[PDB]
Structures are given as C-alpha cells and as structure tokens.
Amino acid sequence: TTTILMLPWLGYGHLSAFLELAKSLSRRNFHIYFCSTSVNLDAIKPKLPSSFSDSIQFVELHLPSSPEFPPHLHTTNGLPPTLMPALHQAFSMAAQHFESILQTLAPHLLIYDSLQPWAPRVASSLKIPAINFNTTGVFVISQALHPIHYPHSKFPFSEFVLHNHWKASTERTRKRGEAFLYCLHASCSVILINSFRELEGKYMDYLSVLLNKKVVPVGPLVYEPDEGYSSIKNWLDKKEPSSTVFVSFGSEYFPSKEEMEEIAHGLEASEVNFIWVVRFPQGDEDALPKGFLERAGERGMVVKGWAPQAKILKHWSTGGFVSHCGWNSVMESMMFGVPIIGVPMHVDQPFNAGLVEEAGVGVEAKRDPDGKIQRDEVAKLIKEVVVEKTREDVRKKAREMSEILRSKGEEKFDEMVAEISLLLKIEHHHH
Amino acid sequence: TTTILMLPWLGYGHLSAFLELAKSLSRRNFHIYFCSTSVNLDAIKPKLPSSFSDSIQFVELHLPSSPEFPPHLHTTNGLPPTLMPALHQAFSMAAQHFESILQTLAPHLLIYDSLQPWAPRVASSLKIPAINFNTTGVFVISQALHPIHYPHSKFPFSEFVLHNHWKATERTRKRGEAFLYCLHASCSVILINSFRELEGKYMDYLSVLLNKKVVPVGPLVYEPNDEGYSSIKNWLDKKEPSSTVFVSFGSEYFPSKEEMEEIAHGLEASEVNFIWVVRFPQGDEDALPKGFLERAGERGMVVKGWAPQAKILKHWSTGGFVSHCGWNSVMESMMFGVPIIGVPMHVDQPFNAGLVEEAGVGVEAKRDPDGKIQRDEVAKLIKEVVVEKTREDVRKKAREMSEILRSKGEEKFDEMVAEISLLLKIEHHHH
Ligand SMILES: O=c1ccn([C@@H]2O[C@H](COP(=O)(O)OP(=O)(O)O)[C@@H](O)[C@H]2O)c(=O)[nH]1
Numbered sequence: 070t071t072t073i074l075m076l077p078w079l080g081y082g083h084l085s086a087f088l089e090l091a092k093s094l095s096r097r098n099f100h101i102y103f104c105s106t107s108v109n110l111d112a113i114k115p116k117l118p119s120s121f122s123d124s125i126q127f128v129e130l131h132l133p134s135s136p137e138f139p140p141h142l143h144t145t146n147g148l149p150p151t152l153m154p155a156l157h158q159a160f161s162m163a164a165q166h167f168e169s170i171l172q173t174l175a176p177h178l179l180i181y182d183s184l185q186p187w188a189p190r191v192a193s194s195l196k197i198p199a200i201n202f203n204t205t206g207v208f209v210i211s212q213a214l215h216p217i218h219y220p221h222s223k224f225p226f227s228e229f230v231l232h233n234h235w236k237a238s239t240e241r242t243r244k245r246g247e248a249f250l251y252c253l254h255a256s257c258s259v260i261l262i263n264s265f266r267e268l269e270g271k272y273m274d275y276l277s278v279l280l281n282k283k284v285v286p287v288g289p290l291v292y293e294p295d296e297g298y299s300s301i302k303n304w305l306d307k308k309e310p311s312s313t314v315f316v317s318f319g320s321e322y323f324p325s326k327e328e329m330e331e332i333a334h335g336l337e338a339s340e341v342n343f344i345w346v347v348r349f350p351q352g353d354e355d356a357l358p359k360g361f362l363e364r365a366g367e368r369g370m371v372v373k374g375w376a377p378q379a380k381i382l383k384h385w386s387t388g389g390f391v392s393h394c395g396w397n398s399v400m401e402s403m404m405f406g407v408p409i410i411g412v413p414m415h416v417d418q419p420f421n422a423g424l425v426e427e428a429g430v431g432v433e434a435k436r437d438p439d440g441k442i443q444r445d446e447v448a449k450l451i452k453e454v455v456v457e458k459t460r461e462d463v464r465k466k467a468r469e470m471s472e473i474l475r476s477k478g479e480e481k482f483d484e485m486v487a488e489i490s491l492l493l494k495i496e497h498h499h500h
Numbered sequence: 501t502t503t504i505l506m507l508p509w510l511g512y513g514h515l516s517a518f519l520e521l522a523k524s525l526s527r528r529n530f531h532i533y534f535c536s537t538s539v540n541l542d543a544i545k546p547k548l549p550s551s552f553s554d555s556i557q558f559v560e561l562h563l564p565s566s567p568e569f570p571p572h573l574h575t576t577n578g579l580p581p582t583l584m585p586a587l588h589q590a591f592s593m594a595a596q597h598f599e600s601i602l603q604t605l606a607p608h609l610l611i612y613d614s615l616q617p618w619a620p621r622v623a624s625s626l627k628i629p630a631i632n633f634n635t636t637g638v639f640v641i642s643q644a645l646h647p648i649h650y651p652h653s654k655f656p657f658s659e660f661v662l663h664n665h666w667k668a669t670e671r672t673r674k675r676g677e678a679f680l681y682c683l684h685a686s687c688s689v690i691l692i693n694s695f696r697e698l699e700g701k702y703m704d705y706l707s708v709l710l711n712k713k714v715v716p717v718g719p720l721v722y723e724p725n726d727e728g729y730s731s732i733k734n735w736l737d738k739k740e741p742s743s744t745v746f747v748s749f750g751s752e753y754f755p756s757k758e759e760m761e762e763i764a765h766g767l768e769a770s771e772v773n774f775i776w777v778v779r780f781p782q783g784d785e786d787a788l789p790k791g792f793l794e795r796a797g798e799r800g801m802v803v804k805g806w807a808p809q810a811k812i813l814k815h816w817s818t819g820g821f822v823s824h825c826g827w828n829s830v831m832e833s834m835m836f837g838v839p840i841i842g843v844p845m846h847v848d849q850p851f852n853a854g855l856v857e858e859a860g861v862g863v864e865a866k867r868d869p870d871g872k873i874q875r876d877e878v879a880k881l882i883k884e885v886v887v888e889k890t891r892e893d894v895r896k897k898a899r900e901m902s903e904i905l906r907s908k909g910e911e912k913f914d915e916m917v918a919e920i921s922l923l924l925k926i927e928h929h930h931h
C-alpha cells in the first residue's frame with residue numbers, strides 16, 4: 070500500500086482542509102498518516118468518521134513545551150495573537166521530531182502546508198517526494214505574486230481593489246513572503262490548491278505562469294457532518310425560511326470591541342434573525358453593546374466558543390452568512406448555497422471577500438476610509454440579501470453555484486492522483 | 501480480491517438498482533462481475549462512471565435466440581407485454597450458460613434478483629454462497645406475505661387498502677412460490693433497497709414472517725454529473741421555479757389510449773408545465789388526444805422514447821412528478837425532494853403509491869371503480885401540489901424526507917458488508 074504523510078499548518082482551518090483531502094486519498098486506496106499537534110488532532114478527530122480510521126491514522130507532532138507555552142496552546146485556534154510568533158518559532162523547532170517521524174514511518178509521499186519551509190527539506194534529505202497543498206484559494210496567492218513581477222501594472226483579470234486599510238521590518242515581511250513562496254516553489258512538480266476552475270480557473274493559469282509550476286486544483290473540499298445543535302435547531306425550527314444569518318469570524322480571530330459594536334448594531338438595524346458565535350482568548354458576554362441581546366429578543370442568539378457551522382448553514386431557516394471570509398467558510402457557504410455578507414478581517418480574507426463579490430454569490434460590507442466596519446453597511450446588506458431579498462441576483466447566483474459544486478464527484482481528485490502516481494514512478498527510478 | 505457476480509432480473513429498473521449496489525460494493529474493495537443480456541448491459545453502461553470499469557466488469561449472459569425473439573428483445577425495456585412469458589422462459593433457459601459463467605469466473609459470492617429461482621441453485625451446486633437482493637421496497641413484499649399467514653386479519657401496521665382494480669388459479673400460486681423461494685433460499689440474509697425511516701416496521705414484520713434477516717441497503721439513487729438534456733434544460737431554464745411536472749411510467753409499461761387521454765386531459769386542465777415521456781413497443785404521437793399538444797403550446801413538451809429523468813427531477817423548475825410509482829422513480833423523487841403525484845399501473849406500483857401517500861411525500865390519483873384513471877383527479881392534485889401550492893404539507897414533508905436521505909452516506913452499506921464477510925468466512929471453513 071502507498072503511504073502519504075500529511076502535515077498541515079497548525080490552524081484549525083488548515084487541519085480541516087487537509088482532513089478532507091486525506092479522506093479523498095483514502096478513498097483512492099492510499100494510507101494516510103495525519104500529522105499535527107495533539108491539541109489539533111483532538112480538535113479535528115470529530116470530523117473523521119470511524120470507517121476511515123483504518124486508513125487515516127493520526128501521528129502526534131511534538132513542539133517544544135514550557136509552562137508558559139504548554140501543549141494546549143500549540144494551535145492558532147483561540148490563540149492570543151501575541152503568541153503567534155512563539156507558535157511559528159516552536160513549529161520550526163519541531164523539524165527534528167518530524168525527521169524522526171519520517172524516518173520511522175518512511176512514507177512514500179509527503180504533503181505539506183505553506184508555513185513550513187523546513188518540511189520539504191527534511192523530506193528531500195530522506196529521499197521522500199513532497200508536494201505542497203494550499204488550503205487558501207488561488208486569487209490571493211496570484212494577487213501576492215503579481216506585483217513582484219509587475220510592480221507598475223495592475224492585476225489584469227479582476228476589477229478588485231484592495232482597500233487601503235489592508236495595504237498598510239520590510240526585510241522581515243520579505244522573509245515571510247520568501248518562506249511562503251519557497252514552500253510552493255519547492256513543491257515536487259505540482260502544487261495542490263483547494264479551489265475549482267469555474268471560480269478561479271484563469272487565476273490558476275496566471276499563477277502557474279508566474280510560478281513556472283503546474284497548479285492542480287482539488288476543490289471544492291467541504292466537510293459535511295448534539296454538539297449543542299439540538300437547542301440551536303429547535304430555535305431555528307421556529308423561524309421562517311431563509312430568515313436567519315449565521316455570524317462567525319473563524320478559529321483564529323477575535324474582533325475588537327469597536328468591531329463587535331458595529332456588527333451588533335448592524336444586526337439590530339437589519340431586524341434579521343441571527344446566530345452569532347462569540348469567542349474569548351483561551352486564558353480569558355460583555356464584548357457586546359449594552360442591551361443588545363435584550364433588544365434583540367427572540368431574533369438573536371449568541372453561542373459561546375464554537376457552533377456547528379455546517380449544520381447551521383444547511384438549515385432551511387438560514388438565509389445568509391455574515392462571515393470573515395475564511396476560505397473554508399467561503400467554500401462551505403458556496404456548497405450550501407448560502408449568500409455571504411463579507412466582513413473580512415485580515416490575511417487572505419479581503420481577497421476572498423472580493424472574489425465572493427466578483428463571482429456574484431455574495432456581497433462585501435465595505436470599511437470606511439478609516440478602515441472601520443460600518444453598522445449602516447452591515448445592516449443595509451443584510452436587509453437587501455436576507456430580510457427583504459431585493460438582491461435576487463445574488464441569491465440566484467448562490468443557488469446556481471451550489472448546484473455546480475453539488476454536481477462534483479470523485480473526479481475532482483483524478484488530476485492529483487495521476488500526478489502523485491507519476492511523481493512516485495519517476496522518483497522510484499531515481500532512488 | 502473478493503469477487504461478487506451480480507445477476508439482476510432483465511428489467512431496466514432492476515439493472516439500475518443492481519448497478520448502484522455494485523458501486524457501493526466496489527467502493528468497499530470488492531470486484532464485481534455485472535451479468536446480464538447485452539441489450540441490458542448496453543442500456544445501463546452510461547450510468548457507470550469510467551472510474552469503476554476497473555472494478556465493475558460487464559459479463560454477457562446469453563439467452564436462447566430466434567429471428568422472432570432476437571437479442572435486442574432480451575429485456576423488459578419497451579417489450580411488447582405479450583412477450584413477457586417468452587422472456588421469463590428464455591431467462592430460465594440461460595441457467596446452463598450461467599453455470600458456465602460461474603464455473604469460469606469462480607466468484608466468491610452471488611447476488612441475485614427475485615425472478616430467477618434457478619440462480620441460487622446453480623450457485624449452491626458450485627459451492628458459491630448466494631444472497632438475494634430485492635430492488636423493490638419492503639411494503640409490497642410484506643403485504644404479499646401477510647395473508648398467507650393471516651388470511652382473515654388486516655395488514656397490521658398500515659391503513660392502506662388495495663383498490664379492487666388490482667385485487668382482481670394455481671398458476672398465480674406458482675409465480676408467488678417462485679418469488680418467495682428466491683428470498684427464502686437466500687443465505688442468512690435478504691438485501692432490500694429501502695431504509696428504516698420509511699419501512700422499518702415493515703422490515704421487522706417481513707423478517708418475522710419469512711424467518712430470515714432483512715438487511716436494508718438504503719436509498720440507492722443514481723445521480724449523473726448530453727442525452728438530449730441541453731434542449732430540455734434550455735426549455736426548463738425558462739420556466740418559473742417549481743412550475744413543471746415530469747411525467748413518466750418507467751421502462752416496461754405502455755399506458756393505454758384511454759389512460760393517455762385521461763392523463764393528458766388532467767395535465768391540460770391543471771395548466772401546469774409538463775415534460776412527458778411517451779414510448780411505443782420496440783418494433784413499431786398518435787396516442788394523445790387530438791390537438792392536445794397544440795393547445796398546450798410551449799407549456800407542454802413530449803419527449804419520445806427516453807428522458808434524463810434524474811436531471812429533470814433535480815431542476816429548479818420541477819415542482820412535481822406524475823409517476824407510475826416504480827420504486828426507483830419513488831426513491832429518486834424522494835432523494836430530490838420532488839412530491840409525487842401517483843398514477844400507478846400494475847405490479848408493485850399500487851403499494852408504492854400507498855406508501856408514498858402514507859408518508860405524506862406525495863398523493864395518489866384514485867382510480868374509478870372499474871379501474872379508469874380520472875382526468876379530474878389528475879388535474880386536481882397537480883393544481884394543489886404543483887401549480888397552486890396549497891398542499892404545503894406534502895411539499896414540506898417532501899423536503900424533510902430529502903433532508904434525511906441526503907444525510908445518508910456509505911454507512912448504509914455497513915450491515916451488508918458485515919454479513920457478506922461473515923458468510924464467506926463460515927463457508928470458507930465448510931468448503
Ligand atoms: O463556530 C465555528 C467556527 C468555525 N467553524 C469551522 O471552522 C473552519 C474555519 O475555517 P476558515 O477557513 O473559514 O477560517 P479560519 O478559522 O482559518 O480563520 C470552517 O470549517 C468552519 O466551518 C465551526 O465549525 N464552528
């Protein structure tokens with residue numbers, strides 16, 4: 070049996086994409102070693118059905134540990150953002166344990182994420198072929214690489230303009246982008262990416278040109294399942310159809326008090342039904358404006374910490390998704406046909422939001438010239454998309470996009486499997 | 501590799517269910533020999549994605565041939581109904597070739613349909629274990645067995661009453677004996693194409709009556725990914741949502757002119773949009789009332805011969821299904837959330853329509869005392885269910901049933917695989 074060890078970056082959204090890809094490979098008779106830290110392995114285990122455990126085994130990666138930075142913090146999930154440098158540094162120091170794991174398990178292939186340049190190096194040292202897998206979409210990467218080659222010409226296939234709030238240590242920023250691009254550039258023959266040609270094909274071809282490397286899509290990768298759902302479903306069961314927005318900002322971002330107030334007042338003014346997951350950093354309710362939940366009454370529900378996002382998005386009473394536009398959340402909303410109201414925050418999210426808007430399956434709540442979220446913009450877009458449904462074009466496009474994604478089967482993985490087959494056959498000769 | 505030879509009955513609906521079951525087994529690393537007549541293998545091949553051809557091989561079964569009954573007639577598909585006796589006899593005369601196939605390929609398991617009592621006997625003579633797989637639902641079988649054991653008591657777990665048109669000779673006994681032998685002769689279990697949410701109490705009753713375990717193998721529903729669809733799609737793309745009824749009576753029934761006239765007149769009175777599949781026997785429009793199509797205009801479409809039923813049922817503009825209530829068409833309609841307007845014709849269809857009515861996912865157009873279809877009932881039910889959506893209870897339960905069936909996965913096959921694994925381990929010792 071052909072074995073693959075998979076090494077996601079230490080974020081929950083990365084674990085998620087990597088696990089869906091592992092399921093696809095296990096269905097093609099590959100045996101998977103799924104490698105991450107124990108806190109991440111525990112968090113993602115509920116998304117692996119028992120029928121897979123025979124062919125997808127979890128393998129614990131050890132990061133350096135101290136009482137100030139213990140194992141339960143070896144993840145971006147709910148991490149204090151001022152510990153993010155520690156997490157990156159600790160991850161790079163796990164390279165020798167990673168080498169021990171690769172020497173012991175001797176997998177035939179490594180698939181690794183885009184935040185660990187050391188990973189393909191350890192694999193090369195052991196004569197193990199390694200392929201990069203990206204859990205973002207294509208648009209953001211192509212937007213990042215384009216000005217390196219064309220610093221005086223605009224990105225040529227989209228009308229998207231990145232708001233100045235996100236355009237705003239130059240060597241360190243360069244070293245981070247160099248590490249990121251190295252992971253892609255170092256990949257054996259192809260890079261894998263969680264996307265599909267109907268949405269990003271021309272960006273795929275453009276990125277392949279800039280990188281001088283084939284880009285292989287493997288998307289849509291979307292997980293489909295009481296973790297608290299019984300109470301949530303009972304409340305949703307009492308709403309009209311397409312009347313409710315889910316509100317969430319993912320696994321590794323905490324919106325500021327001022328940001329929560331603009332969103333909260335946006336929700337209130339829209340008069341929509343809403344389920345809103347509010348989170349607090351691991352060490353640390355009152356993040357919300359005074360009286361907001363009371364005025365909301367039966368229209369509002371705040372879930373603390375974590376919610377069954379997929380089940381909520383698939384409920385008949387859900388008409389919209391106020392999202393930070395993390396890529397898994399975007400793919401999920403598209404697969405389930407729920408139009409997105411974009412409130413992006415950082416990293417790839419402003420690009421994802423622009424791609425959502427450009428494809429016509431959602432809208433973006435624009436920040437003001439100070440870079441602040443606007444309660445009026447949030448309330449307006451929820452009114453048009455969800456409450457009054459005057460944006461019939463967006464709801465239709467979202468429906469049409471869901472029909473497209475629902476039609477995709479295991480053929481979406483054929484190209485990856487053939488490139489894996491070719492790569493191993495070539496390297497077996499050379500070894 | 502463990503090998504399974506599958507022998508459906510020579511109907512297209514039996515081929516279809518058996519093929520879906522073959523796919524489920526291929527995904528569990530079984531190798532499938534799919535055995536039938538060449539005219540049936542040709543008919544079903546477009547439903548088998550190319551990725552399965554390495555593990556699902558087609559094996560031709562030869563029936564006695566004559567210029568008056570040549571190979572292209574070796575199927576119920578569009579067969580003149582007066583040739584049905586010749587088809588059964590010809591099927592039974594293939595037992596020698598079937599033995600030759602079994603001796604040559606030496607499969608580890610036979611899965612056989614319920615119209616070939618000779619098939620388990622041939623397997624038993626070669627020490628090949630054999631399991632019966634029923635492509636109907638359970639309701640009809642338990643309704644057939646119940647009066648054998650309780651001739652003076654009502655069927656205990658339903659309100660359904662069979663209309664006298666269908667209630668109306670040791671030869672009937674001999675066919676019932678042959679059917680029940682196929683189930684009774686099955687090794688340890690019987691497989692059936694149903695699910696507990698709809699038929700669980702009937703499964704338990706059937707298991708007690710037969711003194712054999714009944715194993716549901718779930719919603720088996722083929723889903724495609726042009727067969728005349730682009731023209732139909734363009735037509736459908738221009739209707740309102742949920743505005744259209746698909747109309748079909750399956751693979752092996754030609755409604756009479758009197759029935760066609762009642763259905764056409766019901767369709768016209770409802771003023772619904774309709775796509776209507778009209779067929780004529782293999783050898784051989786004229787079957788419809790004068791000017792029915794011209795009066796229908798662009799609201800009506802008649803497809804001759806065959807239609808992409810699943811794609812049409814999944815289309816956003818399809819709001820109902822005027823169906824003979826073949827079980828594959830019922831399962832498909834339920835999976836796709838399309839309420840059924842029942843017009844059953846013979847065999848198991850009246851029972852399937854009753855179950856559909858019982859579940860509230862569809863309605864039955866009642867026949868007249870002498871057995872005549874009622875144009876007024878056809879029109880009334882299409883009016884209430886499709887055109888003017890006043891039967892929201894049916895729509896809702898149709899949507900709720902589709903949500904249940906959409907949530908099912910590969911686990912629906914766990915029980916069948918476990919019993920197969922046990923049966924092969926037991927008979928391995930005994931051989
Ligand atoms: O309360 C929550 C919040 C998030 N998610 C899931 O967590 C993942 C978040 O990934 P994403 O790419 O959207 O953003 P990130 O967490 O990486 O910032 C997605 O699968 C969401 O469905 C969830 O199940 N419940």
Ligand SMILES: O=c1ccn([C@@H]2O[C@H](COP(=O)(O)OP(=O)(O)O)[C@@H](O)[C@H]2O)c(=O)[nH]1
Binds near residue numbers: 829
């Ligand atoms: O024009 C048609 C009519 C039927 N079918 C398919 O043929 C099968 C019919 O099986 P069913 O049990 O409903 O009826 P039967 O043909 O056995 O009487 C189903 O899968 C239908 O989707 C189809 O593809 N096109």
